Structure formats: C-alpha cells, structure tokens
Design a protein around this motif. Structure first.
Motif, short mmCIF file in Angstrom:
data_model
loop_
_atom_site.label_atom_id
_atom_site.label_comp_id
_atom_site.label_asym_id
_atom_site.label_seq_id
_atom_site.Cartn_x
_atom_site.Cartn_y
_atom_site.Cartn_z
N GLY A 43 0.81 -1.20 0.00
CA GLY A 43 0.00 0.00 0.00
C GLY A 43 0.85 1.26 0.00
O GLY A 43 2.07 1.27 0.23
N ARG A 44 0.18 2.39 -0.22
CA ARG A 44 0.90 3.64 -0.39
C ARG A 44 1.63 4.06 0.89
O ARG A 44 2.72 4.59 0.82
N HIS A 45 1.04 3.82 2.06
CA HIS A 45 1.72 4.19 3.28
C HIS A 45 3.01 3.42 3.45
O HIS A 45 4.03 3.97 3.89
N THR A 46 2.99 2.13 3.13
CA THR A 46 4.21 1.34 3.27
C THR A 46 5.23 1.76 2.24
O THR A 46 6.42 1.83 2.55
N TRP A 47 4.79 2.08 1.03
CA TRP A 47 5.73 2.65 0.06
C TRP A 47 6.42 3.90 0.60
O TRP A 47 7.65 4.07 0.45
N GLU A 48 5.67 4.78 1.26
CA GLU A 48 6.31 5.97 1.82
C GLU A 48 7.21 5.62 3.00
O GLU A 48 8.20 6.33 3.24
N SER A 49 6.90 4.56 3.74
CA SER A 49 7.73 4.15 4.87
C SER A 49 9.06 3.57 4.39
O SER A 49 10.11 3.83 5.00
N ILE A 50 9.03 2.78 3.32
CA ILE A 50 10.25 2.18 2.80
C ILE A 50 11.11 3.24 2.14
O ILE A 50 12.32 3.35 2.41
N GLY A 51 10.51 4.04 1.28
CA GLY A 51 11.14 5.23 0.77
C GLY A 51 11.89 5.09 -0.53
O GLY A 51 12.42 6.09 -1.02
N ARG A 52 11.96 3.90 -1.11
CA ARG A 52 12.69 3.67 -2.36
C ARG A 52 12.30 2.29 -2.87
O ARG A 52 11.88 1.43 -2.09
N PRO A 53 12.46 2.04 -4.17
CA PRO A 53 12.09 0.72 -4.72
C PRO A 53 12.97 -0.38 -4.15
O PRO A 53 14.17 -0.21 -3.97
N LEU A 54 12.38 -1.52 -3.92
CA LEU A 54 13.14 -2.66 -3.45
C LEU A 54 13.82 -3.30 -4.64
O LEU A 54 13.14 -3.70 -5.59
N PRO A 55 15.13 -3.44 -4.65
CA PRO A 55 15.80 -3.97 -5.83
C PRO A 55 15.53 -5.44 -6.05
O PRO A 55 15.31 -6.21 -5.12
N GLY A 56 15.50 -5.83 -7.32
CA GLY A 56 15.37 -7.22 -7.67
C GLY A 56 13.98 -7.76 -7.55
O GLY A 56 13.79 -8.98 -7.59
N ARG A 57 12.99 -6.88 -7.42
CA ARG A 57 11.59 -7.25 -7.28
C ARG A 57 10.76 -6.28 -8.11
O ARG A 57 11.12 -5.11 -8.24
N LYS A 58 9.65 -6.76 -8.65
CA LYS A 58 8.68 -5.86 -9.27
C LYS A 58 7.84 -5.22 -8.17
O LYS A 58 7.18 -5.93 -7.40
N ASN A 59 7.90 -3.92 -8.03
CA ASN A 59 7.25 -3.18 -6.95
C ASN A 59 5.92 -2.67 -7.46
O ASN A 59 5.86 -1.87 -8.40
N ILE A 60 4.82 -3.15 -6.84
CA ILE A 60 3.48 -2.74 -7.22
C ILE A 60 2.86 -2.02 -6.02
O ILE A 60 2.81 -2.55 -4.92
N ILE A 61 2.40 -0.80 -6.24
CA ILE A 61 1.85 0.05 -5.19
C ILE A 61 0.37 0.22 -5.43
O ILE A 61 -0.04 0.73 -6.48
N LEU A 62 -0.44 -0.08 -4.42
CA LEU A 62 -1.87 0.19 -4.44
C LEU A 62 -2.14 1.59 -3.91
O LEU A 62 -1.69 1.94 -2.82
N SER A 63 -2.83 2.38 -4.71
CA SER A 63 -3.24 3.72 -4.29
C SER A 63 -4.45 4.11 -5.12
O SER A 63 -4.52 3.78 -6.30
N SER A 64 -5.37 4.84 -4.49
CA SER A 64 -6.50 5.38 -5.24
C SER A 64 -6.13 6.56 -6.13
O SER A 64 -6.95 6.96 -6.97
N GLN A 65 -4.96 7.13 -5.96
CA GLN A 65 -4.59 8.33 -6.68
C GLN A 65 -3.44 8.05 -7.63
O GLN A 65 -2.72 7.06 -7.49
#
Ligand SMILES: NC(=O)c1ccc[n+]([C@@H]2O[C@H](COP(=O)([O-])OP(=O)(O)OC[C@H]3O[C@@H](n4cnc5c(N)ncnc54)[C@H](OP(=O)(O)O)[C@@H]3O)[C@@H](O)[C@H]2O)c1
Ligand SMILES: Nc1nc(=O)c2nc(CNc3ccc(C(=O)N[C@@H](CCC(=O)O)C(=O)O)cc3)cnc2[nH]1
Ligand SMILES: [Mn+2]
Ligand SMILES: [Mn+2]
Ligand SMILES: [Mn+2]
Ligand SMILES: [Mn+2]
Length: 159
Positions: A43-65
């Motif tokens: 989710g978007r909050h966790t994306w903001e908590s991590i703060g950068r893409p995780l390498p070696g993985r496809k990063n998919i973010i759920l957000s309404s916006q």
C-alpha cells in the motif's frame, strides 16, 4: 498463489507512526530471501515508509490516486494489482495493515516473524482464524549481539 509476509510484535503490532521502531537484521535478511525475484504488492503508506524501490523485485503500489514515480507500478484495485503481477508462481504482499486485510482471504501462505518485543503501535496484522492454517515451518532464535529480541520464523499454509 498469493502469500503475505509480515513481522509481528506482541499483540500483532506491525507499526507505529508509519514506521517500524525495532531493528532486527536477521528478519530483514529473511524478508529479502523470501521476496527476491518475486513481485511485491504494498500500500501507499508502506511505500512511503520504505522510501525507495526494493531492488530485484517488481514493486506494485496500491493507491486510489495517480502514481508519482515511474520506477514502480501503480494500480488502483486488488484485481489490478494481481493482474499486474502476471503469471508467476508466487505473489508477495508486504503490507501494510489495510492491504493485509484485503489479501488475507485470497492468500495460501503466511510468512510470519514473531518478535518478542512490546511495541506501542497503531497498526495491527489482521486477526486470522487459527483453524484455517497449518504450520509447516518454524524456527526459534534467541537474541544475540546483532538482534536485540528473540524471534520465531513461521510459515503457515491454508488447510
Ligand atoms: N511489520 C511489518 O511487517 C510491516 C509490513 C508493512 C507495513 N508495516 C507498517 O504498516 C504501517 C502502514 O500500514 P497502513 O495500514 O497504514 O497502510 P497500507 O496498507 O500501507 O497503505 C494503505 C493505503 O494503500 C492504498 N490502498 C489500500 N488498498 C487499496 C485499494 N484496494 N485500492 C486502492 N488503494 C488502496 C490507499 O492509498 P491512497 O490513500 O493513496 O488511496 C491506502 O490509504 C506502517 O507503520 C508500516 O511501517 C509493517
Ligand atoms: N518479516 C518482515 N520483516 C520486515 O521488516 C517487513 N517489512 C515490511 C515492510 N517494510 C520494509 C522496510 C525495509 C525493507 C528493506 O530495507 N529491505 C531490504 C533489506 C535486505 C537485508 O536486510 O538483507 C531488502 O532488500 O529487502 C523491507 C521492507 C514488510 N514485511 C516485512 N516482513
Ligand atoms: Mn474492480
Ligand atoms: Mn494469467
Ligand atoms: Mn506473533
Ligand atoms: Mn524483547
């Protein structure tokens, strides 16, 4: 197959003020080994908590916006998130609380770290019905010089 991976403190606390206040390097290593080369949904909050893409993985973010960063894939619903992963053997859902709630009914496997630490928090892992899950792996570790709390790695599979 959908799997959830999380680290839980006492009382199923997973976070406080959009952060994780503990530091357990062995658990971060376990997270990396179990997620590398797989898609990760967050989710978007966790994306903001991590703060950068995780390498070696496809990063998919759920957000309404609309997305604000083209290094990751932005989706607007659970079904779109799943479809964006394509035909892979295992999709990893990496939180946070609201995201875990939505994917738990669809999940076949839980990768849980139980940390012996009491944390004031404001986010919890969903209540999960114990009868629905079989423990297929567990491994206990005492605290050491690098990991200041004891912890238990567990993998559960839906019965
Ligand atoms: N210990 C652990 O294992 C662990 C793991 C992950 C996270 N965490 C912690 O968990 C906390 C964050 O959890 P949280 O529950 O606040 O947030 P979250 O689940 O990361 O993010 C929720 C946000 O995701 C978007 N979202 C969720 N479901 C959606 C859907 N079906 N369609 C569209 N958008 C959707 C919304 O974003 P918009 O508002 O943009 O629409 C929603 O506000 C932090 O403290 C973090 O450190 C802990
Ligand atoms: N067991 C578990 N532990 C966690 O810390 C965790 N964290 C999240 C969400 N937050 C985060 C925060 C940081 C990193 C991170 O920095 N990961 C690196 C560390 C590699 C290593 O330490 O060896 C990574 O490449 O995955 C990942 C997830 C989701 N599920 C989890 N599950
Ligand atoms: Mn839809
Ligand atoms: Mn397909
Ligand atoms: Mn626990
Ligand atoms: Mn402790």
């Amino acid at each position: 197959m959908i799997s959830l991976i999380a680290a839980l403190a006492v009382d199923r606390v997973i976070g406080m003020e959009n952060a994780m206040p503990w530091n357990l390097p062995a658990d971060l290593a376990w997270f990396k080994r179990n997620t590398l080369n797989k898609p990760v949904i967050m989710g978007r909050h966790t994306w903001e908590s991590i703060g950068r893409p995780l390498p070696g993985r496809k990063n998919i973010i759920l957000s309404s916006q609309p997305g604000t960063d083209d290094r990751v894939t932005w989706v607007k619903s659970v079904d779109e998130a799943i479809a964006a992963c394509g035909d892979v053997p295992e999709i990893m859902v990496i939180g946070g609380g609201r995201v875990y709630e939505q994917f738990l009914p669809k999940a076949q496997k839980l990768y849980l770290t139980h940390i012996d630490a009491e944390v004031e928090g404001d986010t919890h892992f969903p209540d999960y019905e114990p009868d629905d899950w079989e423990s297929v792996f567990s491994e206990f570790h005492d605290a050491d010089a690098q990991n200041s709390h004891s912890y238990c790695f567990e993998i559960l599979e839906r019965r």
